[PDB]
Nucleic acid binder design. Structure first.
Lengths: 59, 52, 160, 138, 44, 154, 49, 222
RNA sequence: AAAUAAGAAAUUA
């Protein structure tokens, strides 16, 4: 994970497998359907809201 | 085996000898323990009100 | 992540059609290909057989060719596209770069700076956007331009 | 209790800290017992917290009564709890009227509450009690 | 009780309240009538 | 039905003895349930079976409870009685499955495996294209091509 | 839900809200109260109507 | 006739006001429009009336029902930046080695993913496999939706890992990760025998046996 | 031929 945070593709040239970014993280980024992250579903946001405004205790 | 009778079942080493004791049987359902504890405690108090 | 069978069952005592068991070269395995492998009947060992049909390594090789065909077939049914060879000038801004051949470098992102990260390899272009480029001779456009959806328009899903 | 020999400010400092502590305890314990629908047991534990907080010349804060009232299930418990909270403010000889419907005795409170006699709303002890009443309504 | 007891001993185990530790227990019970004596035909 | 050939019948008890491996394999049991549910009929025997077997599986690695010796033999006989009950609860199921499957196949214009009864359609076992030219159990000669149980339109 | 009722009740509540307290004597305290906030505030008149 | 859209009960009214107030603070995922907010409020109230129904049906069902160092509590080993914890499962000593990366999801949409694919697909929708991967979140009294997981296969790869042994290994990986993340959660887990590792293997291949494993060849008296 | 990542349970010298 640390390697991947500081990864840049331009630095990878001339290195073997050391030049490859961390498999999972990189492939996850390359995926487009991943790029859209769902909002915190209505039931959830309502539930939390009710507990911290109506009932005076945060979840 | 060969032209001789099979050994009785107890003459073989334990079939599950390699499975740990915590797996046979699994004690699952731990989540509920605390719940029922509270419950029972609560019930006890109920059963005093009847009496007293 | 396929559930299908990729391995030929090992030779053993004769399997028979049972609950829970079928013959080895039964017609229901490998989409009926097992025909190719089958010696029918109560085979008389001494006098008859075709040796390769009982051989584990040979049989498994055949099955593997068949699986390969299945995959190839499905990968080609999966294409909606042709590769066209278009001169460097006329190609969209994203391909104006250098594009390493397959398995040569790290799988490559189309345009990190514009927020598109996807394999340039698998990016597919619409025959309608490349019209001016691909059929310059034709004058009038052969394909009518794509109609696109206004995502700012008030429509049934916006609750108006 | 067993120390009368200390300076007064010491005794009051430590009494303040102790009340703080009992209240944090009561809250924490309501949160523990509420999701299990424990009502009788919870009510007892509150009875003990209240009892210990009165010898100390204070009570359960309105705050913990709010958090409590929102977790109650039976109606009986809800009203009896508002009742308790009221009685917690006044001593036991205080003037009160009986609701025969609920078989309860509501103390007249306002005589005791702090009142200012420029003035913010925060000076009345009524802003406090109404909070609990409100919580009961909701 | 000791907070230690309620941290470590408040779970189901072969000590506390074990689920049946033995094979061949009664899985399924229902209220039913008795069958006739020897309902099975001796055969072949 | 794709599996058409003559087959070997196994006694019900040995089929049941396969436990989780086949008779109670979750996958199989679920599509039995699907068949019943779709026909609009409760699956009680399946559910009894699933209960018994579920629990069989859960305790399958434990040793049986310690036996104290009795002249009565009441314990041994009660264990036995319970056991044959369960066996019968499952026979009933096994029967139901073969029953309904044959019936449903009759509705779907399906041809069964060789030498198999379908109550309304083929009373004696249905056969076509066997390795052996006669019907095996009638000892009567088979027609070419394979006999048809259903009228032609599809 | 009760039609034979809720007028009497909305009424009752509005009395309480206009008075500001149910205490019998009318204190200077209650007056200072009425100066600080508005008990008969738009929410209660609105919902009364 | 017509129905009214506007809130029916006092309950609806109160929740509707809440939703408005949330919309004005611009919190993520809250409906901007009043119609959506109505639908939301109605749906919520209905959900709570359902919950009350299930609780009642439970209370009624309950009456007609038929019948020394303890455990090692550790500190949390977690990546301070990514907030990830790492466990490993095994079964068959070789065949299945898995590694779970487990991290907390604050949005409450958690998901489990195996080798880049959603858990449903990987275990082939078979429930009796996937519930094994649910179990550690149960035993620990946790909501699985508060956690994101990715499992990594370090053993022998195969096109399908849906089968009970592989699932056993999975469950174990997840449980070990969970323990590194929430230390105290170790005590329920250890008691329910999740963390416990069974050592079993297919017999090594060996040419003496017919099938290559268990079956000795034919014997004849001289 | 088999109680060994499988799934079997009660008649010792």
């Amino acid at each position: 994970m640390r390697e991947f945070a500081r990864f840049d593709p331009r630095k990878s040239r001339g290195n073997g497998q050391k030049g490859f970014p961390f498999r999972d993280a990189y492939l996850t980024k390359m995926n487009e359907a991943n790029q859209k992250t769902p909002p915190p579903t209505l039931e959830t946001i309502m539930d939390r809201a009710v507990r911290e405004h109506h009932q005076h205790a945060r979840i | 085996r060969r032209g001789k009778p099979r050994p009785r079942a107890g003459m073989f080493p334990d079939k599950y000898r390699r499975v740990p004791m915590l797996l046979k049987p699994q004690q699952g359902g731990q989540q509920y323990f605390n719940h029922f504890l509270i419950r029972s405690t609560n019930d006890r108090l109920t059963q005093q009100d009847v009496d007293n | 992540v396929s559930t299908g069978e990729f391995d030929h069952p090992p030779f053993q005592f004769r399997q028979r059609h049972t609950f829970n068991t079928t013959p080895l070269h039964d017609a229901n395995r490998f989409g009926g290909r097992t025909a190719y492998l089958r010696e029918i009947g109560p085979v008389n060992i001494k006098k008859q057989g075709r040796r390769f049909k009982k051989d584990p390594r040979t049989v498994q090789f055949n099955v593997d060719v068949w699986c390969a065909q299945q995959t190839l077939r499905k990968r080609w049914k999966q294409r909606d596209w042709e590769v066209i060879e278009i001169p460097f000038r006329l190609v969209p801004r994203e391909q104006q770069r250098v594009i390493p051949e397959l398995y040569t470098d790290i799988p490559q992102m189309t345009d990190p700076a514009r927020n598109d990260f996807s394999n340039i390899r698998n990016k597919v272009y619409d025959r309608e956007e490349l019209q001016g480029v691909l059929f310059p001779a034709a004058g009038a456009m052969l394909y009518p331009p794509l109609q696109r959806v206004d995502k700012q328009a008030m429509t049934l899903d916006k609750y108006l | 209790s067993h120390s009368a020999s200390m300076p007064e400010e010491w005794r009051e400092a430590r009494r303040l800290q102790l009340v703080e502590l009992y209240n944090n305890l009561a809250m924490e314990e309501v949160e523990r017992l509420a999701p299990h629908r424990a009502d009788r047991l919870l009510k007892e534990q509150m009875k003990r917290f209240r009892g210990n907080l009165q010898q100390l010349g204070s009570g359960l804060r309105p705050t913990v009564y709010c958090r409590y009232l929102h977790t109650t299930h039976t109606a009986a418990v809800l009203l009896e709890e508002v009742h308790n909270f009221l009685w917690e403010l006044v001593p036991n000889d205080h003037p009160a009227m009986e609701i025969p419907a609920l078989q309860l005795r509501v103390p007249f409170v306002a005589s005791v509450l702090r009142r200012p006699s420029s003035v913010s709303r925060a000076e009345f002890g009524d802003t406090d009690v109404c909070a609990v009443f409100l919580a009961a309504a909701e | 009780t000791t907070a230690e007891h309620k941290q470590q001993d408040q779970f189901y185990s072969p000590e506390n309240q074990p689920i049946s530790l033995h094979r061949n227990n009664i899985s399924y019970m229902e209220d039913v009538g008795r069958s006739v004596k020897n309902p099975t035909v001796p055969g072949l | 039905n794709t599996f058409l050939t003559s087959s070997v019948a196994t006694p019900p008890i040995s089929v049941i003895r396969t436990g989780p491996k086949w008779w109670a394999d979750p996958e199989r049991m679920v599509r039995q349930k699907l068949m019943y549910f779709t026909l609009g009929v409760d699956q009680l025997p399946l559910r009894r079976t699933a209960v018994i077997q579920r629990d069989l599986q859960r305790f399958h690695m434990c040793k049986p409870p310690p036996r104290v010796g009795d002249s009565t033999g009441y314990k041994r006989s009660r264990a036995a009685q319970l056991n044959t009950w369960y066996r019968r609860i499952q026979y009933q199921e096994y029967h139901m499955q073969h029953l309904f499957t044959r019936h449903v196949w009759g509705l779907l214009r399906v041809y069964p495996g060789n030498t198999t009864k379908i109550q309304g359609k083929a009373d004696d076992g249905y056969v076509g294209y066997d390795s052996v030219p006669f019907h095996r159990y009638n000892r009567a000669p088979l027609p070419f091509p394979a006999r048809e149980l259903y009228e032609r339109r599809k | 839900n009760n039609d034979e009722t809720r007028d009497s009740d909305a009424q009752r509540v509005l009395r309480y809200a206009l008075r500001g307290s149910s205490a019998a004597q009318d204190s200077a305290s209650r007056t200072l109260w009425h100066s600080v906030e508005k008990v008969a505030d738009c929410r209660v008149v609105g919902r009364y109507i | 006739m017509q129905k009214l859209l506007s809130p029916r009960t006092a309950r609806h009214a109160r929740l509707f006001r809440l939703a408005g107030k949330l919309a004005d603070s611009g919190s993520p995922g809250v409906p901007k429009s009043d119609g959506e907010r109505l639908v939301w409020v109605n749906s919520h109230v209905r959900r709570d009336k359902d919950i009350s129904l299930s609780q009642e049906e439970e209370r009624i069902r309950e009456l007609m029902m038929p019948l020394q160092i303890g455990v090692r509590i550790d500190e949390a080993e977690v990546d301070p930046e990514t907030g990830i914890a790492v466990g490993r499962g095994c079964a068959d000593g070789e065949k299945y080695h898995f590694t779970a990366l487990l991290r907390e999801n604050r949005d409450h949409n958690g998901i489990i993913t195996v080798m880049g694919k959603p858990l449903s697909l990987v275990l082939d929708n078979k429930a009796w496999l996937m519930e094994m991967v649910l179990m550690p979140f149960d035993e620990a009294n946790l909501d699985y939706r508060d956690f994101d997981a990715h499992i990594v296969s370090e053993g022998h790869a195969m096109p399908s890992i849906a089968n009970e042994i592989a699932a056993f290994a999975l469950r174990m990986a997840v449980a070990n990760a969970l323990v590194k993340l929430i230390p105290l959660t170790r005590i329920p887990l250890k008691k329910s025998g999740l963390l416990s590792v069974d050592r079993r293997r297919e017999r090594g291949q060996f040419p003496g046996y017919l099938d290559g494993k268990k079956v000795k060849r034919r014997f004849a008296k001289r």
